[PDB]
Amino acid sequence: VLSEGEWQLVLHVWAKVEADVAGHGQDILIRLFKSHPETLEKFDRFKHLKTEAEMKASEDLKKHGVTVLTALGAILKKKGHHEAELKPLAQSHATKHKIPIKYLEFISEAIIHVLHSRHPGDFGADAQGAMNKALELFRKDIAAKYKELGY
């Protein structure tokens, strides 16, 4: 569980993300796909992309990045009180999209990496630790629903 101070650090950088949601989403999905290529193959929309330049040039990738970060921001702003928000996401990601929890770990690492690059003065160590706790909590709670569902 995060303290109020930790949530403050998390949401302070997140409000910066929300000034350029689409650029952050591109950098995060691209980072994810390069670092962990098994993740790209889970996307029928994107698995044709074979180079970073192709990924950067894909408007549909940019659109999905906005979808992802918009959903994550709504979760983070609930400061842990996010049950309602996680129910449909776990259901589709476990049962329809078939995404392992490890791949949620991979996108968490991509998020943290991109935040560090784009917002270093608001993403020093205290903030990094706070954000990692928030994304761990996100994973802990999705994993409990994956377990309910036998995934």
Ligand code: HEM
């Ligand atoms: C921060 C973590 C993530 C968030 C907030 C997120 C959010 C979303 C949202 C909002 C949708 C559309 C609604 C739905 O189907 O539930 C979606 C779709 C999808 N997600 Fe995620 N997602 C996350 C991580 C991942 C990861 C790591 C993968 C794959 C490795 C993944 C694969 C998919 C797929 C395949 C779809 C369907 C795309 C389509 O064909 O339109 N998601 N995600």
